[PDB]
Amino acid sequence: MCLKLNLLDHVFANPFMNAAGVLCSTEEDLRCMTASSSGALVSKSCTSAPRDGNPEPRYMAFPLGSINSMGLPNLGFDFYLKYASDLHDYSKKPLFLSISGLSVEENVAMVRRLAPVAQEKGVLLELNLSCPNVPGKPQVAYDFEAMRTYLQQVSLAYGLPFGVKMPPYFDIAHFDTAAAVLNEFPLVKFVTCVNSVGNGLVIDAESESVVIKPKQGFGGLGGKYILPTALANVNAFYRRCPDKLVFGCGGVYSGEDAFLHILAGASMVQVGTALQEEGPGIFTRLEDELLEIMARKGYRTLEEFRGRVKTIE
């Protein structure tokens, strides 16, 4: 029985990795993720320039999940590029670098300089499309024409296989349109579903107050709140993009939740809120729990059940 995967020309000990933004901002964080039992790691979505992010408190967690308005705090592209080129130990596990430029030109600039390091060291690009474009317009992946522009420009500039991080969608027309856009780009080899569920609002009844400072308390939701939305998006894109891999993210706290992701179609399974709350020890637990479910079911590998969710009649 085994959790091994071979994808994107890399070998992974198991499907588990951090979700971008969690335990991945500093050198310390990346070294921690590397020392963990995860099968891979991704860096914090970066910008060309370092950012302090939004005012605190900007993340909070609760029994059913988390809310955040971090504001893209990061050490800047040059730091994450240096990590990928000079610091990461590729013999331990694969590295993904996530980018979230504030314009198409900023993304193009970064990917042009990442390309040679991708080619030589094997760092994998995850392009975050669930992020700001022009304020007062929807986020990029909710603006299909912007999305298409970003993917055309990054594909030309980078020239290598990459993946995309998508926000969740809630309407079948949007699943159809989004996937049609992604299927125009043969270099998009993976799709990570999902980023946080946008603009939720947590209110504390005792204090009668929102719990995070930025944006009048509004922020992206993660955790147990989002698991059925995550699974839906994984399966929707799995069905619509047969030539691409799908990575699942959202609501994973247990090997059972991971098994559901994988049944929906996930290759890799990313862990955000629960990793933020439990710490990197979570990965041994998730591995053990998933292997227990596989043993009970008689499955020896992940491919025996990936995407094999049953429908009724």
Ligand X SMILES: Cc1cc2nc3c(=O)[nH]c(=O)nc-3n(C[C@H](O)[C@H](O)[C@H](O)COP(=O)(O)O)c2cc1C
Known binding positions for FMN:
20, 44-45, 128, 165, 194, 223, 250-251, 272-273
131, 193, 241, 249: which one is catalytic? 131
Location of structure tokens 């049953």: 310
What gap in Å lies between CA 313 and CA 307, rounded to an integer? 17
Residue 71: contacted member of its own copies, ligand X, ligand W75, none (CB under 5 to 8 Å, by partner type): ligand W75
118: closest CA among 163, 161, 74? 161
User: Smallest distance, Å, CB 128 to its own copies?
Assistant: 15
- Asked if 193 interacts with its own copies (CB under 8 A), we say no
b/e string for 211-249 if b means 16 or more Cβ within 10 A? bbebeebebbbbbbbbbebbbbbbbbbbebbeebbbbbb
Q: Which of 129, 231, 271, 282 binds its own copies (CB under 8 A)?
A: 231
Residue 131 known to be catalytic: yes
Angle between helices 172-182 and 144-158 (to 10 degrees): 20
Largest CA distance in the chain: 55
Site string for ligand X, 184-203 (x = CB under 6 A): -----------xx-------
Q: And the tokens for 292?
A: 């227990």
Q: Which of 11, 35, 49, 64 binds its own copies (CB under 8 A)?
A: 64
Q: Identify whether 116 is preceded by a cis peptide bond (ω within 30 of 0).
A: no
Site string for ligand W75, 207-226 (x = CB under 6 A): -------------x------
Tell me the residue length of the chain: 313
Residues 6+ apart with CB under 8 A from 162: 111, 124, 125, 126, 127, 154, 187, 188, 189, 190
Tell which positions 44-83 bind ligand X, by CB under 6 A: 44-45, 59, 66, 68, 70
Residue 170: contacted member of its own copies, ligand X, ligand W75, none (CB under 5 to 8 Å, by partner type): its own copies
- Residue closer to its own copies by CB (options 55, 281) is 55
Q: Residues in the site for its own copies, rule: CB under 8 A?
A: 55, 57, 64, 67, 133, 135-139, 142, 167-176, 197-203, 205, 207-210, 212-213, 215-218, 221, 224-229, 231-232, 235-236, 256, 259-260, 263-264, 293, 305, 308-313
Q: Residues in the site for ligand W75, rule: CB under 6 A?
A: 21, 45, 54, 68-72, 100, 128, 130-133, 139, 195-196, 198, 220
